[PDB]
Design a protein around this ligand. Structure first.
Ligand SMILES: Cc1cc(=O)oc2cc(O[C@@H]3O[C@H](CO)[C@@H](O[C@@H]4O[C@H](CO)[C@@H](O)[C@H](O)[C@H]4O)[C@H](O)[C@H]3O)c(Cl)cc12
Ligand SMILES: *[C@@H]1O[C@H](CO)[C@@H](O)[C@H](O)[C@H]1NC(C)=O
Ligand SMILES: *[C@@H]1O[C@H](CO)[C@@H](O)[C@H](O)[C@H]1NC(C)=O
Ligand SMILES: *[C@H]1O[C@H](CO)[C@@H](O)[C@H](O)[C@@H]1O
Ligand SMILES: *[C@H]1O[C@H](CO)[C@@H](O)[C@H](O)[C@@H]1O
Ligand SMILES: *[C@H]1O[C@H](CO)[C@@H](O)[C@H](O)[C@@H]1O
Ligand SMILES: *[C@H]1O[C@H](CO)[C@@H](O)[C@H](O)[C@@H]1O
Ligand SMILES: *[C@H]1O[C@H](CO)[C@@H](O)[C@H](O)[C@@H]1O
Ligand SMILES: *[C@H]1O[C@H](CO)[C@@H](O)[C@H](O)[C@@H]1O
Ligand SMILES: *[C@H]1O[C@H](CO)[C@@H](O)[C@H](O)[C@@H]1O
Ligand SMILES: *[C@H]1O[C@H](CO)[C@@H](O)[C@H](O)[C@@H]1O
Length: 363
C-alpha cells in the first residue's frame, strides 16, 4: 500500500529511474571496456534520487511514476524518489548551481506554481509511495551564511517557499525530508542548536505536517556514515561523520518541538574514506571518492530511516571553466576533478573515479 505508519522505506523498494540508467548505459558504457563496462551496468541498477531542478523536468517525475505503477502490478512494491530543488535565488552561497527563478522577478510565485505542478503529479500517482528531499543547501545557508548578501536577502522568500512546499506536498503517499546539510556544516557544536531551532520552526510553522518525516543529510557531499577514524580535514569538529551528526541534532529537534524526526543520509559518494579533500569545505567534484554504502532501510540505527543515494554519482557539481557561466572557484581547487562540465551534466571521468573507488565494489 502507498500510505505508511512509520519509516516510509518499510515495505517498499526504492525504484532505480530510467534517467540515470540512460546516462550510464548511453554516456558511460560506450567509453568503457571489460570489467569496468560490466561494473558500470550494475551501478545503473542502484536507486538514486531524481532531481527536479527545473519546472520542465516535472514530466520526468511523471514518467518515472508511470514506470513504477506498471512494476507494482507484477507483485513489486516500488517507491519513487525525487528532489524538490528550484527555489528562487537558489544555491545562495555558491555560483555553480544557480537556478531558473529569481526572487526579483516573481520567483516566489513561480516557485509556488512549480510546487503546484509537483502536487498534481503526486495526486495523479496517489497509489505510489513517494520519497522527497526538500531543497538541498537552502536552510543550512540560512543557519550559517546570513553574512552572504544573496542568502540574507533570500531569507523570507526561502521560508515562504519551503512552508508552501511542505504544506502543499503533505499527502498520505508522501514522505519528505528537509535538507539539513552535513556533519562538516551544521554538525559543528556551535551550529547544532541554531540549526535545530530553524528546522523545528519550519515544522511547527507548517502545522507539523504528517508527511514531513525528518531531515536529509550529506546530500551531494562525501562524509562518512560511521567511520571510526576521523579524517585530517575534520580537525576541530567532534562531529566528524553523519551518524554523529544525526544523533547530535535529533534530540535538539525534540527540544524545540519537533518530536519523532528521522533521517536519511546520502552515501552515493562516500565509499572512500578519507576522501581526497584537502579542506573539508571543498565540495565540488571532489577527487578520491567512490560509490558508497548501497541504499538500504536496514541501517542498524535508531534514527536513520535509510541509507540513500541522493546526488547521482557521475552528474557534475559545477563547471571548472573560469570563463563559463556559473563558474564557482571551488570547482577549480586542487582537489576538484578537472576539466568539469556544467553542474548536473554527465562527467565521465568522475563516474569512472567513483566506480574505480567504489566500496562496496562493483568490480
Ligand atoms: C572549518 C572548516 C574547514 C574547511 O576546510 O571547510 C569548512 C566548511 C564549512 O562549511 C561549508 O559550508 C559551505 C557553505 O558555505 C558548504 O557548501 C555547500 O556544499 C554543498 C554540498 O554539501 C553544495 O551543494 C553547496 O552548493 C555548497 O554551497 C560546504 O558543504 C560546507 O563544508 C564549515 Cl562550516 C567549516 C569548515
Ligand atoms: C511561516 O509560514 C509563512 C507562510 O506565509 C511564511 O511566510 C513564513 O516565512 C514562515 N515562517 C517561518 C519561520 O518558517
Ligand atoms: C557502519 O555501518 C555499516 C552499515 O550499517 C556497517 O556495515 C558497519 O558494521 C558499521 N561500523 C561500525 C563500526 O559501526
Ligand atoms: C496507510 O495509511 C492509511 C490511512 O490510515 C491506511 O488506510 C492504510 O492501510 C495504510 O496503513
Ligand atoms: C505502518 O507502517 C510502518 C512503516 O511505515 C510499519 O513499521 C508499521 O508496522 C505499520 O505497518
Ligand atoms: C520492492 O521490490 C523488491 C523486489 O524487487 C522486494 O524485495 C520488496 O519486498 C519490495 O516489494
Ligand atoms: C537517456 O537519457 C539520458 C539523460 O537524459 C541521455 O543522456 C541519453 O542520451 C538518453 O536519452
Ligand atoms: C542501461 O542499459 C544497459 C543495457 O542496454 C543496462 O545494462 C544498464 O544497466 C542500464 O540500464
Ligand atoms: C541511452 O540512450 C540511447 C539513445 O540515445 C539508447 O539507445 C540507449 O538504449 C540508452 O537508453
Ligand atoms: C566516453 O568517455 C571517453 C573517455 O574515455 C570519451 O572519449 C568519449 O567521448 C565518451 O564520452
Ligand atoms: C563485463 O564482464 C562481463 C563478464 O562476462 C561481460 O559479459 C561483459 O561483456 C563485460 O566484459
Amino acid at each position: 500500500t502507498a500510505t505508511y505508519s512509520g519509516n516510509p522505506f518499510v515495505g517498499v523498494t526504492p525504484w532505480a529511474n530510467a534517467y540515470y540508467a540512460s546516462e550510464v548505459s548511453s554516456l558511460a558504457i560506450p567509453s568503457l571496456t571489460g570489467a569496468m563496462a560490466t561494473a558500470a551496468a550494475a551501478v545503473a541498477k542502484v536507486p538514486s534520487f531524481m532531481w527536479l531542478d527545473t519546472l520542465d523536468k516535472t514530466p520526468l517525475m511523471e514518467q518515472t511514476l508511470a514506470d513504477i505503477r506498471t512494476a507494482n502490478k507484477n507483485g513489486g512494491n516500488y517507491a519513487g524518489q525525487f528532489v524538490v530543488y528550484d527555489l528562487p535565488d537558489r544555491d545562495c552561497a555558491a555560483l555553480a548551481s544557480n537556478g531558473e527563478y529569481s526572487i526579483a522577478d516573481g520567483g516566489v510565485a513561480k516557485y509556488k506554481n512549480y510546487i503546484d505542478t509537483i502536487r498534481q503529479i503526486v495526486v495523479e500517482y496517489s497509489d505510489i509511495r513517494t520519497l522527497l528531499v526538500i531543497e538541498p543547501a537552502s536552510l543550512a545557508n540560512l543557519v550559517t551564511n546570513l553574512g552572504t548578501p544573496k542568502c540574507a536577502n533570500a531569507q523570507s522568500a526561502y521560508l515562504e517557499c519551503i512552508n508552501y512546499a511542505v504544506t502543499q506536498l503533505n499527502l498520505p503517499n508522501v514522505a519528505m525530508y528537509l535538507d539539513a546539510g552535513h556533519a562538516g556544516w551544521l554538525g559543528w557544536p556551535a551550529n547544532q542548536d541554531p540549526a535545530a531551532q530553524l528546522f523545528a520552526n519550519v515544522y511547527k510553522n507548517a502545522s507539523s505536517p504528517r508527511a514531513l518525516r525528518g531531515l536529509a543529510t550529506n546530500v551531494a557531499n562525501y562524509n562518512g556514515w560511521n567511520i571510526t577514524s576521523p579524517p585530517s580535514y575534520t580537525q576541530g569538529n567532534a562531529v566528524y561523520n553523519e551518524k554523529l551528526y544525526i544523533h547530535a541534532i535529533g534530540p535538539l529537534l525534540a527540544n524545540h518541538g519537533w518530536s519523532n524526526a528521522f533521517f536519511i543520509t546520502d552515501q552515493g559518494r562516500s565509499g572512500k574514506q578519507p576522501t581526497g579533500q584537502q579542506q573539508w569545505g571543498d565540495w565540488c567534484n571532489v577527487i578520491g571518492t567512490g560509490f558508497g554504502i548501497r541504499p538500504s532501510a536496514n541501517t542498524g540505527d535508531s534514527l536513520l530511516d535509510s541509507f540513500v543515494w541522493v546526488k547521482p554519482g557521475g552528474e557534475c557539481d559545477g563547471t571548472s571553466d573560469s570563463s563559463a557561466p556559473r563558474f564557482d572557484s571551488h570547482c577549480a581547487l586542487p582537489d576538484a576533478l578537472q576539466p568539469a562540465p556544467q553542474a548536473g551534466a554527465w562527467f565521465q571521468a568522475y563516474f569512472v573515479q567513483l566506480l574505480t573507488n567504489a566500496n562496496p565494489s562493483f568490480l
